[PDB]
Each structure stands twice: as structure tokens, then as C-alpha cells.
Amino acid sequence: KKYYEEYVITGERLKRKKEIEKKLNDLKELTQNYVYSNKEPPIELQNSLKEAQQKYLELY
């Protein structure tokens, strides 16, 4: 009764990681090369990078 529930909690992490591990790897690559010349990935998108990272400053 403990072990399956531990499979739930550790299982629910990786579902929530792949939701966000994909979104980090996409939105950074827009900001990597030549699009960031004049705010075309603006501060709203640059904060959304930091939003999902602050979710995994701790949970990771």
C-alpha cells in the first residue's frame, strides 16, 4: 500500500516533467540565435523561461 503510492508520486513527476522539459527546450532555441535582436522574444517570453525554471529550481 506504500509502494504503489510511491509509484504514483514518482510517476506523476515525470508526467509533469515532460510537460515542461519540452517547453524549456523549445522556447530557449528561439532566444538562442538572432531573434532576440530587438525584443522579438520579449520580456514576457523571457520571463516564461524563468517561470518554468523556478518550478524546477526546487522540484528537480
Partner: protein, 61 residues
């Protein structure tokens, strides 16, 4: 027979510097490029060596 073939390698084509030092452009950058998400600990300090080895190389380059 050995001592002369050492010099043609730098001579026929490119020298010792161009040969050797281009890998420390490439092979070290081959490693850091995969290092995407490293909020983990002390391997952070290896950025602060290997990226500073680029500054060690590219100033000498």
C-alpha cells in the same frame, strides 16, 4: 628514417598548432553543448573551468 617524417606533417598541409589546437576548439565544445539543464551542483564549476579553458585557448589562438 624517423626524424625527417616529423617535419613533413607540419609542412605538407598544416602545422602543429593548426592541427592540435583546433580540437580544443571542437572536442571541448562537443561536451559542453549537451549540457542543457545543470541546476545540479559542483559540475557547475566545470563550466567555470572548461569555458574558461576556451578563454585560455582562444587568447593563445
Amino acid at each position: 628514417n624517423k626524424a625527417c617524417s616529423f617535419l613533413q606533417v607540419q609542412l605538407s598541409g598544416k602545422p602543429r598548432i593548426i592541427d592540435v589546437t583546433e580540437r580544443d576548439i571542437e572536442r571541448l565544445s562537443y561536451e559542453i553543448s549537451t549540457l542543457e539543464k545543470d541546476v545540479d551542483k559542483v559540475s557547475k564549476k566545470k563550466y567555470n573551468k572548461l569555458i574558461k579553458e576556451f578563454e585560455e585557448k582562444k587568447e593563445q589562438l
